[PDB]
């Protein structure tokens, strides 16, 4: 149990690398503005966050 490389050398290695190109600079802020505030969805008090994979 002194052995190193243990946890990293017995884990599976997988990927699903992107084909889709993400935006930079201006447009990345444009989407951030619209998706949060100018949609306009919000409803009754909730905890949701901008992520939820629950």
């Amino acid at each position: 149990l002194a052995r190193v490389g243990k946890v990293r050398g017995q884990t599976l290695k997988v990927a699903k690398q992107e084909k889709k190109k993400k935006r930079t600079g201006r447009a990345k802020r444009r989407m951030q503005y619209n998706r949060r505030f100018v949609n306009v969805v919000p409803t009754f008090g909730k905890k949701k966050g901008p992520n939820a994979n629950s």
């Binding site: 002194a2 190193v4 490389g5 990293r8 050398g9």
Partner: protein, 142 residues
């Protein structure tokens, strides 16, 4: 309060403050220079040495682990420093009797975390970073 507020007491103020400043811990290390003489560093951010031999270092309770450090002698002092090695499997990328580059933890004098007796870590083996060795965007140059 409880002290002079004269108009001609500049001497009694500026000589008192110059004495009671030495009771501060920080000030007393900076200006005596005993810091420099005692440290294995010259005040330099990094330093370079040559490996002596791998070791295993036990953890302080509650935590129990073996932490796989090294022990190193320096180029320019010849004295010995015990240095941590970062992420999993990076120990293997350090080979005995080669040069390394060391660096402090980020607490600037004191032992960090649950590992005692270690005050230094390792960043580059031989002009190549632990990152690129670990991630696999570079290979051993030998």
């Amino acid at each position: 309060m409880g002290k002079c507020r004269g108009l001609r007491t500049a001497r009694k103020l500026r000589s008192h403050r110059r004495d009671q400043k030495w009771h501060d811990k920080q000030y007393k290390k900076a200006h005596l220079g005993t810091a420099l003489k005692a440290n294995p560093f010259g005040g330099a951010s990094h330093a370079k040495g040559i490996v002596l031999e791998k070791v295993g270092v036990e953890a302080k309770q509650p935590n129990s682990a073996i932490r796989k450090c090294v022990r190193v002698q320096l180029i320019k002092n010849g004295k010995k420093i015990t240095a941590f090695v970062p992420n999993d499997g990076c120990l293997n990328f350090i080979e005995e009797n080669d040069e390394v580059l060391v660096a402090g933890f980020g607490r600037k004098g004191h032992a960090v975390g649950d590992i005692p007796g270690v005050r230094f870590k390792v960043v580059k083996v031989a002009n190549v970073s632990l990152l690129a060795l670990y991630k696999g965007k570079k290979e051993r140059p030998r």
